[PDB]
Amino acid sequence: HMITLENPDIKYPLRLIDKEILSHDTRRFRFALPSPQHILGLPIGQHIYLSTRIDGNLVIRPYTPVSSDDDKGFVDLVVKVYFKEAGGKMPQYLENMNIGDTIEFRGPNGLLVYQGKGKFAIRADKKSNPVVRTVKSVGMIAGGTGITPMLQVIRAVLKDPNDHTVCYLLFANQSEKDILLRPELEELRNEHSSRFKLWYTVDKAPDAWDYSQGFVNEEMIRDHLPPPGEETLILMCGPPPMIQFACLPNLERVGHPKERCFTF
Amino acid sequence: HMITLENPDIKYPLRLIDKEILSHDTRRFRFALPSPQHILGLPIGQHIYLSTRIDGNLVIRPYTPVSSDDDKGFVDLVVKVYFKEAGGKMPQYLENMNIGDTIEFRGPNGLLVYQGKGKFAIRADKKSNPVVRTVKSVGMIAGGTGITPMLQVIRAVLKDPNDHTVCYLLFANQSEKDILLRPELEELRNEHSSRFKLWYTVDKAPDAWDYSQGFVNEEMIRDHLPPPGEETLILMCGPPPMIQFACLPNLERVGHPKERCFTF
Ligand SMILES: Cc1cc2nc3c(=O)[nH]c(=O)nc-3n(C[C@H](O)[C@H](O)[C@H](O)COP(=O)(O)OP(=O)(O)OC[C@@H]3O[C@@H](n4cnc5c(N)ncnc54)[C@H](O)[C@@H]3O)c2cc1C
Ligand SMILES: Cc1cc2nc3c(=O)[nH]c(=O)nc-3n(C[C@H](O)[C@H](O)[C@H](O)COP(=O)(O)OP(=O)(O)OC[C@H]3O[C@@H](n4cnc5c(N)ncnc54)[C@H](O)[C@@H]3O)c2cc1C
């Protein structure tokens, strides 16, 4: 394997090769890897950082590519750009990049690594040896672009026909139009209904809505995520308030132990 | 070492980051390696190829960077562009590149590798194991840009305070103004007069000229290159006619055996 991210401390300027508008505020930003034969080299569960100086300050933000190490030659980021009404500087930077412009990628980073077959290696910190535990059910609470760390895991699980792990995604977004990667998710769900449960909640639901509405709550966690247990791991990725006010307290009320919860 | 050229079959698009006019027809074309920490990974004696499609045809040409693996982050090519009277498509392509444009580099390539300490490993072909031989004297006949493969070796030798190899360069150019990298060469010669002998010949000499004039001939080879012998290797890099009509027959008349001559 020609690995792009050979050194986690290296900032690899990768050229933007295409920008694709996916929705009113999200897009696919594809960057060329060092050669068409390269793969990113991003363990499942980890992310990369984009960094560049914006208005004189180094801006470094995490992104979990929606591409995988099966993809050669490019890395695909699904990025939400924040159109007004904290800064969204990096997405805006990406938004303003012209094709061929470079931005620095670094990685892999992340305290959690899905080793496959339900095995998650989670490090207390960068310097700690991961605690490896095998679970059978991975609950995933994603808010908006927090879907990418989840999708990376889901896809890893699902592409392994021998991975019996069942992923339960509770995907929260502002509105139906904001359900990022819905087609991707639903196809995964349609094709792997046994190992992938999918549920949505939107802050504002359309008049006709078959899913949940509102911030994630206990009921959604209790009913759309696996129950607390030694074989359950809950993963979370979403806005800080989502984590702090919609996830943590309800996971607690549902009974999910902090140690069987991981937040990207 | 973060090696750029990890795979010889890979075409690494490197961004042009600097274009520097060196003379009326030569330039430094500096390309960024994958990261500022990368080195090219180019064994001494070898070259890289630049390749890109020019007017619908793949154009792949050899270049020996004047940078070395001591240089991190960039590769420096000294390239002669061919202006008004051969095809020079690649140099013209480079000439026409805008900063940030990429061109594909591949390598290392070359049947000769200087292993240091007078040791040259020369392969009959890419599939043959190199014949390693230690010489004490390396005669070098370079015509124009053919100086780069020589300079790479000269610098490698001179860089090593324990390399006793003496390099004798017979550098041919069309005119004094065409003596590519003269300042570099003369500084090397000035600082390592013991292991670096330098002689020039120019097709057309200026009114005041202390060196040779005309195509390389027997006398120049006899008197400015080490004598034929088991401890002598003659390297050549120049235009085909220089090789065929000024080098080979005179090397032969001087007595340098084909096996102790190598043409880049
Ligand atoms: C391994 C390799 C690496 C290379 N690296 C580079 C590089 O770094 N940069 C780059 O620009 N190119 C590079 N080249 C291209 C190569 O250096 C040039 O093709 C050729 O070697 C020299 O070109 P020129 O125009 O510089 O020569 P000129 O300037 O034409 O001339 C040198 C000529 O050599 C002799 N000569 C020329 N024509 C004749 C003739 N008809 N009869 C007799 N003697 C003659 C003369 O002494 C004269 O001064 C490389 C090629 C190889 C194979
Ligand atoms: C490891 C990592 C990887 C990342 N990868 C990417 C990536 O690939 N692409 C990218 O664009 N970003 C990425 N990010 C940024 C991250 O996805 C977004 O910062 C973060 O999780 C939320 O985005 P959001 O704007 O989409 O939330 P919004 O759309 O604001 O919202 C989403 C949802 O979460 C809940 N929520 C929001 N606000 C509140 C509140 N006040 N109270 C309660 N619940 C609330 C709601 O359910 C809401 O629908 C990453 C971040 C990390 C840490």
Q: CATH number for the domain including B239? A: 3.40.50.80
Query: What resolution does the deposited structure have, in angstroms?
Result: 1.8
SS (H, E, C) chain A: CEECCCCCCCCEEEEEEEEEECCCCEEEEEEECCCCCEECCCCCCCEEEEEEEECCEEEEEEECCCCCCCCCCEEEEEEECCCCCCCCHHHHHHHCCCCCCEEEEEEEECCEEEEECCEEEECCCCCCCCEEEECCEEEEEEEHHHHHHHHHHHHHHHHCCCCCCEEEEEEEEEEHHHCCCHHHHHHHHHHCCCCEEEEEEEEECCCCCCCEECCCCHHHHHHHCCCCCCCEEEEEECCHHHHHHHHHHHHHHHCCCHHHEEEC
Question: Residues for chain B: how many in total?
Answer: 264
The closest alpha carbon to A4, from B226, B38, B21, B146, belongs to B38
A167 and A235 housed in the same domain: yes
A78 touches ligand 2 (CB under 6 Å): yes
Residue A262 lies in a domain: yes
- Listed in sequence order, the residues at least 6 apart from B122 whose beta carbon sits closer than 8 Å to its beta carbon are B111, B112, B113, B130, B131, B132, B133, B262
Whose alpha carbon is nearest atom 13 of ligand 1?
B63
Quick one: B252 and B208 in the same domain?
A: yes
Determine the 3-state secondary structure of B141 from DSSP: strand
A61 neighbors A38 (Cβ within 8 angstroms)? no
Q: Which of A7, A10, A13 sits opposite B32 (nearest CB)?
A: A13
DSSP assignment, residue B41?
A: -
Query: For residue A58, what are the β-bridge partners?
Result: A53
SS3 B106: strand
DSSP code for B144: G
Indicate which residue's Cα is closest to atom 29 of ligand 1.
Answer: B144
Cα A58 to middle of ligand 2, angstroms: 21
Torsion of CA A126, A129, A135, A140, to 10 degrees: 0
Contacts of A194 (CB under 8 A, 6+ apart): A166
B6 to chain A: which residues are within 8 Å by CB?
A: 2
B114 forms bridges with which residues in the sheet? B120
Residue A235, judged by CB atoms within 10 A of its CB (0-12, 13-18, 19+), counts as buried
Task: Assess contact for A75 and A20: CB atoms under 8 A.
Answer: no
Q: Locate the chain A residue with the closest alpha carbon to B104.
A: A35
- List the catalytic residues of A: 47, 63-64, 237
Give residue A156 CA to ligand 2 midpoint distance, Å.
21
Look-up: residue for tokens 């508008």?
Answer: A21
Whether ligand 2 lies within 6 angstroms of the CB of A80 is answered as yes
Domain end point (choices B66, B92, B109):
B109
Q: Do residues A220 and A118 both lie within one domain? A: yes
Antiparallel, parallel or unpaired: β B212-213 and B196-204: parallel
Q: Which residue of B has its CA nearest to A12?
A: B35
* E strand or H helix that includes residue B184: helix B182-191
Ligand nearest, relative to CA of residue B171: 1
Could you give the CA distance from residue A236 to residue A258 in angstroms, rounded to a whole number? 12
Ligand nearest to C-alpha B87? 1
CB B195 within 8 A of CB B167: yes
Query: Given an 8 Å threshold on Cβ–Cβ distance, is A35 in contact with B12?
Result: yes
Q: Is B247 a catalytic residue?
A: no
Measuring CA to CA, how many Å separate B59 from each of A101, A188, A233, B51, B94?
A: 25, 44, 54, 5, 12
Which ligand 1 atom minimizes the distance to the CA of B203? 49
CA-CA distance, A263 to A143, in Å (whole number)?
Answer: 12
**Is residue B4 in some structural domain?**
no
Residue type, A217: N
Q: Is B258 helix (H, G, I), strand (E, B) or coil?
A: helix
HSE-CB for A52 with a 13 A CA cutoff:
20
ω into residue A149 within 30 of 0, thus cis? no
Residue A181: CA count within 13 A, CB half-sphere:
30
Tell me if A189 sits within 8 A of A80, measured CB to CB: no
On whether both B261 and B134 belong to a single domain, the answer is yes
Query: Tokens at residue B136, please?
Result: 């004490």
Nearest-CA residue of chain B relative to A106? Answer: B35
Q: For residues A227 and A214, give the distance between their C-alpha atoms in angstroms, rounded to a whole number.
A: 21
Give A74 Cα–ligand 2 centroid separation in angstroms: 24
Amino acid B207 reads D
Same domain, B65 and B122: no
Before B257, cis peptide (omega within 30)?
A: no
- Asked whether the beta carbons of residue B15 and residue A102 sit closer than 8 angstroms, the reply is yes
Query: Residues followed by a break in chain A, C–N over 2.5 Å?
Result: 85
The residue to which tokens 């610098």 are assigned: B155
Residue B130 is which amino acid? P
Ligand 1 atom closest to B178 (CA): 29
- Whether residues A81 and A53 share a domain: the answer is yes
On the 0-12 / 13-18 / 19+ scale of CB atoms within 10 A, B22 is middle
Amino acid (1-letter code) at residue B50 = L
In a domain, A3, yes or no: no
According to DSSP, residue B145 is labeled: G
Give the C-alpha separation, B17 to B154, whole Å.
26
- CA atoms of A29 and B210, how far apart (whole Å): 60
Which residue among A6, A12, A32 sits closest to B13, beta carbon to beta carbon?
Answer: A32
Write down which residue in A64, A80, A109 finishes a domain.
A109
Find how far residue A29's CA is from the centre of its chain.
15
Q: Which residues pair with B245 in a beta bridge?
A: none
CB < 8 Å to B13, chain A:
15, 32, 35
- B222, containing H or E segment: helix B218-224
Residue B34, domain CATH:
2.40.30.10
* Spatial separation of the C-alpha atoms in residues A148 and A125, rounded to whole Å: 21
How far the first Cα of chain A sits from its last, in Å, is 26
Rg over alpha carbons for chain B, rounded to the nearest Å, is 18
Q: For residue B28, give the ligand nearest its CA.
A: 1
A95 and A146 both lie in a single domain: no
Tokens representing B198 are 């330098």
Beta strands in B95-195 (DSSP E): 102-109, 112-116, 119-122, 131-134, 137-143, 166-175
∠ CA A175-A176-A182, rounded to 5°: 125
Q: Give the number of residues written for chain A.
A: 264
Under 8 Å between Cβ of A18 and A10 = no
Distance between Cα A96 and ligand 2 center (Å): 21
Tokens in use for B34?
């994958």
Long-range CB contacts (< 8 A, 24+ apart) of B191-195? B191/B158, B192/B158, B194/B166, B195/B157, B195/B158, B195/B163, B195/B164, B195/B165, B195/B166, B195/B167
What is the number of alpha carbons within 13 Å of residue B105 lying toward its C-beta? 31
**Do the beta carbons of residue A184 and residue A151 sit within 8 Å?**
yes
Q: Could you tell me whether strands A102-109 and A74-80 are parallel, antiparallel, or unpaired per DSSP bridges?
A: unpaired
Domain count, chain B: 2
Distance of alpha carbon B255 from alpha carbon B264, whole angstroms? 20
Q: Are B189 and B198 in contact (CB under 8 A)?
A: yes
Among residues B171, B114, B174, which one has the least CA distance to residue B140?
B171
* Alpha carbons B14 and A32: distance in angstroms, whole number: 11
Assigned domain for A125 exists:
yes
* Strands across the sheet containing A57-63: A57-63, A47-54, A102-109, A12-21, A26-32, A74-80
Query: A241 and A199 share a domain?
Result: yes
Cβ atoms of B219 and B251 within 8 Å: the answer is no
Q: How far apart are CA B16 and CA B247, in angstroms?
A: 35
Q: Tell which one of B61, B63, B145, B263 to mutate to probe ligand 1, the residue whose CB is within 8 A of the most ligand atoms.
A: B145
Question: How far does the CA of residue A108 sit from the closest CA of chain B (Å)?
Answer: 16
Show residues of chain A in contact with B37, CB under 8 Å. 7, 10
Residues B76, B25 share a domain: yes
Task: Report how far ligand 2's centroid is from the alpha carbon of A148 (Å).
Answer: 10
The token pair that represents A54 in the structure block: 């914006």
Is A37 within 8 Å of B10 when comparing Cβ atoms? yes
On whether residue B3 sits in a domain, the answer given is no
Domain membership of residue B188 as a residue range: 110-264
Assigned domain for B5 exists: no
The domain boundary residue, chosen from A89, A109, A129: A109
Q: Quick one: CA torsion of A178, A184, A186, A188, rounded to 10 degrees?
A: -150
Residue A250, sorted as left (phi over 0), alpha (psi -120 to 50) or beta, turns out to be alpha
**Annotation says B63 is catalytic:** yes
Helix (H) or strand (E) holding B59: strand B57-63
What DSSP element (H or E) covers B76?
strand B74-80
**CA separation for the pair A133, A119 (Å, rounded):** 6
Strand order in the sheet with B119-122: B112-116, B119-122, B131-134
User: In angstroms, what is the span from residue A64 Cα to ligand 1's centroid?
Assistant: 49
Distance CA B121, CA B105 (A): 23
Do B34 and A34 count as a contact with CB atoms less than 8 A apart? yes
Q: Do B104 and B189 reside in the same domain of the chain?
A: no
Beta carbons of A146 and A185 less than 8 angstroms apart: no
Whether A1 is covered by a domain: the verdict is no
Cβ(B140)–Cβ(B189) below 8 Å: no
Within 8 A of A6 by CB-CB distance, chain B residues are 2
Q: What separation, in Å, do the N-terminal and C-terminal C-alpha atoms of chain B show?
A: 27
B1 is a domain residue: no
Phi-psi region of A112 (alpha: psi -120 to 50; beta: other; left: phi over 0): beta
Nearest CA in chain B to A105: B35
Q: Which residues of A touch B32 (CB under 8 A)?
A: 13
Query: How many angstroms separate the CA atoms of B251 and B228, rounded?
Result: 9
- Put the strands of the sheet holding A131-134 in their side by side order: A112-116, A119-122, A131-134
Contact B18, B97 (CB under 8 A): no
Phi and psi, residue A201, nearest 5°: -140, 145
Please indicate, yes or no, whether residues B105 and B127 belong to a single structural domain of this protein.
no
Please state the separation of Cα B245 from the chain's center in Å. Answer: 19
Distance CA A155, CA A189 (A): 10
In terms of domains, do A139 and A254 share one?
yes
* Beta carbon of A27 within 6 Å of any ligand 2 atom: no
Chain B nearest CA to A151, separation (Å): 28
